[PDB]
Amino acid sequence: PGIVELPSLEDLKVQEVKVSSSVLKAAAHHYGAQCDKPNKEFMLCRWEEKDPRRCLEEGKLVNQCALEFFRQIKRHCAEPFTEYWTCIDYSGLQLFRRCRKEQAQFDKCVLDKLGWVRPDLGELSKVTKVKTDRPLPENPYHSRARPEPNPEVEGDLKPARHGSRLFFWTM
Amino acid sequence: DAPEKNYERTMAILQIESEKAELRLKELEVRRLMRAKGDGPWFQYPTIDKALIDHSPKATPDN
Numbered sequence: 001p002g003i004v005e006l007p008s009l010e011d012l013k014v015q016e017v018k019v020s021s022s023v024l025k026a027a028a029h030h031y032g033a034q035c036d037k038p039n040k041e042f043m044l045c046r047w048e049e050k051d052p053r054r055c056l057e058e059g060k061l062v063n064q065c066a067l068e069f070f071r072q073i074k075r076h077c078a079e080p081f082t083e084y085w086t087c088i089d090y091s092g093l094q095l096f097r098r099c100r101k102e103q104a105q106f107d108k109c110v111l112d113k114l115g116w117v118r119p120d121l122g123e124l125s126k127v128t129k130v131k132t133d134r135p136l137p138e139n140p141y142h143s144r145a146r147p148e149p150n151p152e153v154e155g156d157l158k159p160a161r162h163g164s165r166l167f168f169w170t171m
Numbered sequence: 172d173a174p175e176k177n178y179e180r181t182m183a184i185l186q187i188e189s190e191k192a193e194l195r196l197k198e199l200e201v202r203r204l205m206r207a208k209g210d211g212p213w214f215q216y217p218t219i220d221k222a223l224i225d226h227s228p229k230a231t232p233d234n
């Protein structure tokens with residue numbers, strides 16, 4: 001067949017969000033609140049193109065907007081966030097429910113210094129709409145032309161010409 | 172019976188039987204070509220209904 005095209009290693013260099021999973025899980029509700037638009041443009045491009053090579057730049061925007069999400073935490077509320085993700089980080093299942101007062105301190109300092117409202121129960125699971133400028137893929141599966149169907153039956157049904165025509169049976 | 176009656180009755184019998192014999196040979200040839208090519212209404216062995224395919228957005232994108 002053909003050669004599969006791959007992007008170069010410079011096309012894959014972006015500054016990584018090099019924080020732990022409890023750090024990501026601690027700020028995840030405010031992350032889904034504040035980093036909505038580039039994340040949803042990326043996941044729309046990712047379910048529509050069905051190809052990650054066509055989804056690099058939007059992904060870079062994700063990694064552009066996540067870092068600016070954490071810098072904006074690090075400039076303002078580094079200590080209550082640190083006290084919060086440490087308590088998230090203790091738990092083996094990483095329970096939100098074991099960590100409600102540290103969550104309250106982090107949410108208080110974030111609403112005071114950044115004005116961010118934490119999403120409620122049922123908001124980040126909504127199907128939202130995304131206004132992009134990229135065109136709709138007319139053939140995301142790269143499917144070739146389908147075979148033409150067999151001709152259907154038409155014409156009025158006539159009797160059998162002289163019956164069964166089986167050796168001597170005249171009907 | 173008159174010789175006219177037997178004669179013309181014989182011609183009608185011969186018309187019916189010649190038409191039936193030509194139609195039997197055409198039936199053989201039609202079945203041969205429809206088994207060879209599969210483009211007629213016979214020998215249409217079933218395939219999978221494509222209405223069974225779930226075209227919803229799935230859990231992972233790459234599919």
Ligand SMILES: CCCCCCCCCCCCCCCCCC(=O)OC[C@H](COP(=O)([O-])OC[C@H](O)COP(=O)([O-])OC[C@H](COC(=O)CCCCCCCCCCCCCCCCC)OC(=O)CCCCCCCCCCCCCCCCC)OC(=O)CCCCCCCCCCCCCCCCC
Pocket residue numbers: 168169170171
């Ligand atoms: C206005 C609206 C109302 C109008 C009303 C008008 C009518 C009023 C009267 C009402 C009654 C109508 C009767 C039926 C129509 C006429 C049927 C007919 O004569 O067919 C001729 C038919 C062929 O002749 P034809 O010149 O081509 O057609 C003239 C008509 O146009 C015949 O028409 P066709 O050209 O369209 O024929 C079609 C085709 C013509 O046939 C063909 O093209 C050839 C294929 C025939 C079958 C061959 C099979 C051979 C191997 C098996 C042999 C079995 C053993 C033999 C019998 C042993 C005992 C059972 O038929 C078939 O293929 C079907 C099979 C044969 C059925 C015949 C009727 C049987 C009814 C009574 C059953 C009693 C036993 C009869 C004999 C059974 C064996 C057949 O003759 C035969 O096949 C030979 C058998 C004899 C005919 C049956 C006669 C029926 C009356 C019998 C009374 C006596 C009974 C005694 C006691 C019982 C026996 C022990």
